[PDB]
Symmetry: T
Subunit: 68 residues, 12 copies
């Protein structure tokens, strides 16, 4: 029947976790069609003088493949 594909991305953001996630999805939408779900694999980040510099969320984005 239907077949999906999953790509692994790493969204980053200085705002927070949800922001990093949306950042990855926003870019995914530019080149991938039929985005359906995502799964968080890792949550990490860089440290600056004020604490967290950047949040980095590693996630898998699942999307439906078309006919051909």
């Amino acid at each position: 029947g239907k077949v999906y594909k999953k790509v692994e991305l790493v969204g980053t953001s200085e705002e927070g976790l949800e922001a990093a996630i949306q950042a990855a999805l926003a870019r995914a939408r530019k080149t991938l069609r039929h985005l359906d779900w995502f799964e968080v694999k890792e949550i990490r980040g860089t440290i600056g003088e004020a604490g967290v510099k950047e949040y980095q969320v590693v996630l898998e984005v699942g999307f439906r493949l078309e006919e051909t």
Copy 2:
């Protein structure tokens, strides 16, 4: 001694991770007594036109059992 039980729930929310966790805890409080701790197992979600449709957090809720 004391004995606890753990149940696995998946709280959802279009707002955020904390909201999804709270949603699951809110519902848990209605039928389970002595809620003590939770452990997040998975974080996933669905995608819509604006990006994240709903955040889904799989978590285990531990509570103390009576008698």
Copy 3:
């Protein structure tokens, strides 16, 4: 030497596990060349009134990269 690539697909089917795997592989053949092997990562599915609605097999497909 030789270098391979692995892509993650999710084949579905209402018939069974083998069918879901085949579905994923059939679509893979359309856009990928030199498909060599697959590894099943997860087996899950949706539930309907008759039980299993659709079986969903998450798998990795390995194929030889050209050049």
Copy 4:
């Protein structure tokens, strides 16, 4: 707002994997409402004179909770 609950069951059958899964779902449908999805956690079984005696599929059944 929505909240789901997952329970772990072990379906068994002498027929095969799919049958063992259906067996667990069939029994689940008797006491649980709004069955949505299932995840296979382990596949094991017992051995008899003719090979596989009984297939045993440990799976999680997710279902939606009423507010």
Copy 5:
């Protein structure tokens, strides 16, 4: 064929691992029928002035379900 259900419990005890396990099983038999097997998932505990305060054993208890 037969169907089983597994529940996750945490048995505790100041005496030891075996005691913690038994404590969990003892309570399990008061509300669950047809207990067949258990599986240890975690072993943790709290620390007191004399070392271990209480042992905590997270385990899954498997029991057969009645077709009703």
Copy 6:
């Protein structure tokens, strides 16, 4: 009390999962005594022109050791 041993085998087959499992158990029966249970660890396979060429199921076979 009693003691068991577990060996890891990989059964293969062009027909399906159950068949690959059976193939491993069939061969295990020829040199091992008191076979009791099995656990599936991995499910993988090779790809051919028609899709799945061979299904490969890695499993652990548990058997009682004699004293």
Copy 7:
């Protein structure tokens, strides 16, 4: 070449995940030098009358070691 060390901390906060993480990092910078990155290992918490009492984020903090 360079060598790094990782320490495991648990930051807590009644506000949220990002806050818990920052709390851990804030304390980390008082005794550790050259903090470079962090990795979330677990997310758990305690439950109170209003739901989440406190969020607990277990994380690893990586920092560069000084050759001395």
Copy 8:
């Protein structure tokens, strides 16, 4: 240099964990030479009317292989 081999065994005992472990080692000593170490993989068991019927410890036994 040296090469070791690991076999997986399941020791059982009604006494307790340590007992099940020793049970597996005792039998291992009968047919395997140069036993060096063991690693516990799983701890499970059966349930009887008095609680735990049998403890079952799944472990790997490592031993040194000889010349030929």
Copy 9:
């Protein structure tokens, strides 16, 4: 808020599992303050002529940090 630290120790003992855990906690108490909880990660050991030479339990010890 409060911040904890976790250290990983491997307590040993020729007596048993509980003893090995205690051995690690005893030593921990000498240089670490505010010990709160422990988590067992691994259970292994060495083998001698009488069977188990020494039990080794890898565990993490969590304690609250000051200021």
Copy 10:
């Protein structure tokens, strides 16, 4: 902020581990831009008459995506 993508490759070589890794990176450089980091997931290989025939290293290559 920025977004990265990770692809899974398997580099192979008859000489060793580093060589297999390099082989994967060499090929990755031909079609992927902004390669930043890699992570080794698995190390396996084939066996021949002289021992190791080919070393196979499965790794993830992370690279920055352009906007």
Copy 11:
């Protein structure tokens, strides 16, 4: 169809990783026939005054079972 067996070995060497793997495989050749592949499970070692004393590679060796 064909059935394979996997045994777990631990090769050691003071020279390096590849050497430890080869050591395990060389001894394997002495008593096992039809060695086909290996999978590295762990990489550990002992420490001496000069740093690494011996590298120890835990691996699984797959081979075709006869008949």
Copy 12:
């Protein structure tokens, strides 16, 4: 009675895996006494113009504690 402690380090080197491990052990020897063993947890690295820029090996170093 004996108690060990494990610390997690990340050794780096542009030479190779073994070198990165030695780098971590070398630095470890400067502040830690009774280094006994090490376990490799991850192998990763950075990518440069020529392929691997720097190998990074995350490992745990076990050492014996003084009573």
